[PDB]
Design a protein around this nucleic acid. Structure first.
Ligand SMILES: [Mg+2]
Ligand SMILES: [Mg+2]
Ligand SMILES: [Mg+2]
Ligand SMILES: [Mg+2]
Ligand SMILES: [Mg+2]
Length: 738
RNA sequence: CUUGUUGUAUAUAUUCUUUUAUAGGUAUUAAACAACGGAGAUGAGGUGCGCGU
DNA sequence: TGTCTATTTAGGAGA
DNA sequence: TGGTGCCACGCGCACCTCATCTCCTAAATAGACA
């Protein structure tokens, strides 16, 4: 397979930001024409024009006037059945004969072949291929009543196939049995899905054809592929260029055709391609025609590609370990009791408990929970509530955060003194990660505050909704992103997130090398794909407490609102500024309510900024060269199933039916599972079981294929609670709860 | 050219920064450890703010 | 009369 | 479900994560300049 190496240009280069901007504008004009004619023009018309004017007996004109494509619209060139080069040539020479992109050359006089046809136009065509070949549909949900039109119900069945992935009839049968068979079902939700399931069977193929028709019909409203204003990149493909080792140096030289002559661009050396290594030999003998110019941080970089041989190892199944990912007490918990057998490993929870100062702050049960976690093999102590004590100064966890931080930094300095580099790097990165997330949160909140200030200041008066044109033009003419305030905040946020990513990579590398050193052949992980959880608790804001809640002119003495609104009013969250007649004119977030809003934002943003569903990607990248491999398992009911029986907990019903027990019934406390273990130790030991048992490995995990770059040795196709729950029942992996 | 990017110092000084404050900016001192397939686009989501309901 | 660099073209069913 | 601990509709303007796909070629000829 082909890899990449970046190089930094050492001197001055003709490639400036203006050249790249001109390239980008040419991209935009070409894509604008393509989007304006994606269905209006036919392939046969373009081919006929070329044959009549230029008059060539070439294959790209013969295939365009063939009967397969003579009548079809322009977007069929981007489908995977049409010949790639033939479609490129037909489109390019039609646009060129017509001058449809307004091309008048370029500033550096770069060879028009290497700049226009095989540069921006080639990227445009390759982008429009991705759009067409993965064409989707956009349907807005709607509640269907008992007496509703056929068109409304027909659309909603297509909607449910799009979102919930209901292809086969078994997909519907599992989904209904997942929704139905649970304590306290929602009758309204089941009625809609049953109606749509009935409709799906009667028009199943018509649904699959109307989906395609609607996708093609929506392509008219497509805005086209647009090269963003923040790109600062340019790709040229040149068949004949040269890369030579610079004599008496560790650098390289790029000989490039620039305005009918040869230009030389000097490149800094790269430790990925060193003089005595085999990677320099592979790079220098197998590089490709791809050349990238990118301006990152006001500096020019050059990218290339080259071939390489991958010797990634196969799975072994001799010693496996699971791993759950959490946020409340530990970042990573394995499925292995710590018994002073792993080498290079240090227990930070078994370090915290050795100090009397920390345990004295612990209540009797909390102390037992920490002593519970300290026997497992854990990593990177993250404390969601203790960390928020840094921002919320009037908190109840403040003294615990101070002691935790002090002990952690003392351990860091001690490890630095004793020359234990891997452990020292790990501890320092844990400290820095905890510190940097708070900075990220502060910067995000400031961004929100400044945006609100700017919007209220502008005072956008718009005539009507439902259309952008009716609204004030200033709302599009002067958006908040343009002002200088927004740019500094985003720069600071990007820097903080970069630090976070680096620290996380260091921690994961530590974990992987610990597992690799002792002879663990496979590491199993959850298949995490979403981390954008909804903000499940947002207090009714000032606008929403007076408009949607209709509390604007009600009575404080007699509040005609919801029970939850009564709960909120009873506590001091709000400041109702009533008038002389006890009519509310304004409402203000008090200190308690504002702090609650900040807390909700803090925990919601923690899921994303720490890249919850991307640590398996780091483990895969480390598994590309290492001896330990990676297995991805479905992340359903792993923190809801017994690790000592490998069974689910299902209770009876009022009708005597076995249904699914609530997730909060097998989980009394968030740290304990009813089986008498730690839930993270339970969840990680569930994860290991799929790999451990040959039966479950074949049932849930895909067959081991050839080793590939960024590919787990074991992966999963099934995605969804209904899919996993259905398979769990069929193998009798179920026990009856009390 | 003892050479690229990113992470790692609770390191020295600062009438620096609450818009990174157990951290950064600005200017120094030091050491190794590690990872590195790049570009663009499209799509699905979540979240912020304003105008309406 | 070379001597380098830009620039077309690349299939398919049909036979 | 997973992470926590359970949550309003339209129009827009912006920022983030995560998934997926394209693409990384070679020969032969035409032209620019002496
Ligand atoms: Mg988990
Ligand atoms: Mg940094
Ligand atoms: Mg867990
Ligand atoms: Mg660097
Ligand atoms: Mg470095």
């Amino acid at each position: 397979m082909k890899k990449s190496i970046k190089f930094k240009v050492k001197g001055n280069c003709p490639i400036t930001k203006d050249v790249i901007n001109e390239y980008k504008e040419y991209y935009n004009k070409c894509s604008d024409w393509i989007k304006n004619n994606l269905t209006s023009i036919t392939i046969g018309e373009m081919a006929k024009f070329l044959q009549e004017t230029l008059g060539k007996d070439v294959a790209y004109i013969s295939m365009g006037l063939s009967d397969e494509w003579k009548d079809k619209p322009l977007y069929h060139l981007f489908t995977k059945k049409y010949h790639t080069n033939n479609a490129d040539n037909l489109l390019y020479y039609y646009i060129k004969e017509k001058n449809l992109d307004g091309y008048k050359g370029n500033t550096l006089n770069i060879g028009n072949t290497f700049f226009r046809q095989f540069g921006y136009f080639k990227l445009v065509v390759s982008n429009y291929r991705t759009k067409i070949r993965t064409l989707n549909c956009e349907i807005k949900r709607k509640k269907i009543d008992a007496d509703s039109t056929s068109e409304d119900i027909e659309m909603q069945t297509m909607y449910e196939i799009i979102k919930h992935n209901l292809n086969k009839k078994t997909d519907w049968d599992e989904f209904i049995s997942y929704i139905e068979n649970v304590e306290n079902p929602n009758i309204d939700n089941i009625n809609r899905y049953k109606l749509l399931r009935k409709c799906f069977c009667e028009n199943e193929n018509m649904i699959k054809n109307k989906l395609e028709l609607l996708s093609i019909e929506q392509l008219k409203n497509f805005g086209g592929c647009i090269m963003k204003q923040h790109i600062n990149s340019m790709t040229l493909i040149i068949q004949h260029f040269k890369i030579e080792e610079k004599e008496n140096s560790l650098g390289f030289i790029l000989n490039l055709p620039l305005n009918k002559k040869q230009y030389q661009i000097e490149l800094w050396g790269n430790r990925q391609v060193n003089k005595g290594t085999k990677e320099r030999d592979a790079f220098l003998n197998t590089y490709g025609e791809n050349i990238v110019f990118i301006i990152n941080n006001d500096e020019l970089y050059v990218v290339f590609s080259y071939e390489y041989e991958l010797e990634k190892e196969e799975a072994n199944f001799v010693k496996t370990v699971g791993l759950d990912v959490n946020f409340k007490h530990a970042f990573f918990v394995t499925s292995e009791k710590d018994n002073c057998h792993l080498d290079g490993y240090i227990n930070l929870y078994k370090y915290l408990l050795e100090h009397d100062e920390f345990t004295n702050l612990l209540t009797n049960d909390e102390k037992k929970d920490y002593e519970e976690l300290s026997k497992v093999v854990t990593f990177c102590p993250f404390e969601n509530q203790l960390l928020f004590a840094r921002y919320n100064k009037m908190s109840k966890f403040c003294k615990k955060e101070q002691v935790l931080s002090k002990l952690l930094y003392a351990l860091q300095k001690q490890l630095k003194d004793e020359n234990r580099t891997k452990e020292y790097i790990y501890v320092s990165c844990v400290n820095k990660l905890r510190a940097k997330y708070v900075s990220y949160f502060i910067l995000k909140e400031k961004y929100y505050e400044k945006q609100k200030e700017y919007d209220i200041e502008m005072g956008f008066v718009d005539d009507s909704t439902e259309s952008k044109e009716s609204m004030d033009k200033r709302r599009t003419e002067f958006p908040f992103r343009n002002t200088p305030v927004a740019n500094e905040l985003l720069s600071k946020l990007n820097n903080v997130q970069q630090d976070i990513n680096g620290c996380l990579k260091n921690i994961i590398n530590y974990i992987y090398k610990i597992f690799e050193q002792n002879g663990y052949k496979i590491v199993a992980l959850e298949n995490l794909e979403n981390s954008n959880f909804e903000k499940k608790q947002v207090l009714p804001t000032i606008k929403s407490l007076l408009k949607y809640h209709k509390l604007e002119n009600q009575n404080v003495n007699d509040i005609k609102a919801s029970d939850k609104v009564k709960e909120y009013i009873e506590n001091g969250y709000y400041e109702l500024i009533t008038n002389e007649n006890n009519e509310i004119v304004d409402a203000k977030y008090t200190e308690k309510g504002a702090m609650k809003v900040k807390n909700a934002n803090f925990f919601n943003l923690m899921m994303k900024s720490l890249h919850f569903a991307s640590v398996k990607d780091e483990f895969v990248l480390l598994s590309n060269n290492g001896k330990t491999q990676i297995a991805l398992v479905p992340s359903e009911f792993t923190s809801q199933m017994d690790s000592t029986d490998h069974c689910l907990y299902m209770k009876k019903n009022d009708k005597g039916k076995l249904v699914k027990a609530d997730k909060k019934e097998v989980r009394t406390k968030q740290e304990k599972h009813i089986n008498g273990l730690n839930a993270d130790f339970n969840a990680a030991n569930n994860i290991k079981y799929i790999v451990e048992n040959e039966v479950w490995r074949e049932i849930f995990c895909t067959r081991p294929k050839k080793a590939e770059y960024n590919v787990p040795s074991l992966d999963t196709t099934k995605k969804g609670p209904s899919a996993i729950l259905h398979m769990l029942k069929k193998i009798e992996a179920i026990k009856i709860l009390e």
